[PDB]
Symmetry: none
Amino acid sequence: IQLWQFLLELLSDSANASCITWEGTNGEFKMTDPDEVARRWGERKSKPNMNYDKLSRALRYYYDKNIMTKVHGKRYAYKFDFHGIAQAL
Amino acid sequence: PTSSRLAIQLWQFLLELLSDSANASCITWEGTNGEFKMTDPDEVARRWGERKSKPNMNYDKLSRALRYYYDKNIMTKVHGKRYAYKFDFHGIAQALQPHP
DNA sequence: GACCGGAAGGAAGTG
DNA sequence: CACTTCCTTCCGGTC
């Protein structure tokens, strides 16, 4: 698996709710527990040595590669970008 | 701290410092709890700068690092006491010997 | 001004 | 490459 897919995969499970959620309707999501999620991006990826600090650094390589964007000024909230997302898929 | 790399991270560096009383003037232990105090934060910061060849380094910045260690359970703030922090060896353990 | 933790991104390391 | 690692840098907020 690769990170952008993993997150979608989790979002899909919107029986989760508490730990992650769609904000807007144009690809906008917000971990309402970036800890809970950072664990899961490790449990699955094989790394309990993994945290929000490392998690978000990779979503920043997702900026240059146009795979994802940051929602300017709402906390833990990010924008999915279909442009680069498909170009990988 | 010798175990650290016999066979460079700030927390190793702090241990490196805290292992030699000659450094007492800028940092020292407070108990056998793992608590330590920066007697001279600026002089510590300076020395972390010198090491990473980053000459603009300071306590503002260094302490942001230390703050990221809270999440990795590699240390904690001594609440109230100034420039005072506490190693926790449980997090160092998971760093040297990841046990899933 | 200490202490906090978001948010950015360099830069060498990993599989 | 696809992050991972560990910061360094800047920051507004709260005490």
